[PDB]
């Protein structure tokens, strides 16, 4: 086992990893985008999944862990406070991945969809992902949907190797 990062452009509900990170909202609602796809595939994981901004809460669907990570909605937060909460959400993901003992995890880029406040946050969100996950030994598979984002994420992964 050599821990790795990979990126795939496809629906995270089809992931091939041992657990999934949901781009969750604080109230545990079905939501939109990635969150709604996670709700359709693992609805049982939404039982008592509500948790504050900047935190993560894991709920099992059977034995399959869904890590509900709540990034900030940048429409509501200032750039400085939102940046702090986004970094914090990813730190909580790293703790949960470690506690669960999984060999791999499927992760989306938090706060880059409807919580982005209308801005391109690929680099900001990806760099906070790396800051949290670099010290873990899980294989990390990042899921995206946009063709140009796939290329940019792949370039960012490859240039550190
Ligand atoms: Ca918070
Ligand atoms: Cl590996
Ligand atoms: Cl797909
Ligand atoms: Cl929401
Ligand atoms: Cl989002
Ligand atoms: Cl994307």
UniProtKB/Swiss-Prot annotation:
Domain Macro intervals: 2-161
Positions contributing to ADP-D-ribose binding: 11, 25, 33, 113-115
Segments forming a coiled coil: none
Subcellular location(s) of the protein: Host cytoplasmic vesicle membrane
Outcome of mutating residue 115 to A: Partial loss of mono-ADP-ribosylhydrolase activity; complete loss of ADP-ribose 1'' phosphate phosphatase activity
Consequence the record notes for mutating residue 34 to A: Partial loss of mono-ADP-ribosylhydrolase activity
UniProt topology in membrane: Peripheral membrane protein
UniProt PTM comment: Phosphorylated by host on serines and threonines.
Quaternary state and interactors: Interacts with mRNA-capping enzyme nsP1. Interacts (via C-terminus) with host G3BP1; this interaction inhibits the formation of host stress granules on viral mRNAs and the nsp3-G3BP1 complexes bind viral RNAs and probably orchestrate the assembly of viral replication complexes. Interacts (via C-terminus) with host G3BP2; this interaction inhibits the formation of host stress granules on viral mRNAs and the nsp3-G3BP2 complexes bind viral RNAs and probably orchestrate the assembly of viral replication complexes. Interacts (via C-terminus) with host NAP1L1.
Biological role stated in the UniProt entry: Seems to be essential for minus-strand RNAs and subgenomic 26S mRNAs synthesis. Displays mono-ADP-ribosylhydrolase activity. ADP-ribosylation is a post-translational modification that controls various processes of the host cell and the virus probably needs to revert it for optimal viral replication. Binds proteins of G3BP family and sequesters them into the viral RNA replication complexes thereby inhibiting the formation of host stress granules on viral mRNAs.
Comment field on protein domains: In the N-terminus, the macro domain displays a mono-ADP-ribosylhydrolase activity. The central part called, the alphavirus unique domain (AUD) has a zinc-binding function. The C-terminus region, also called hypervariable domain (HVD), is mainly disordered and binds several host proteins. This intrinsically disordered domain contains 2 SH3 domain-binding sites and 2 FGDF motifs necessary and sufficient for the formation of nsP3/G3BP complexes.
Protein name per its UniProtKB record: Non-structural protein 3
Classification lineage: Viruses, Riboviria, Orthornavirae, Kitrinoviricota, Alsuviricetes
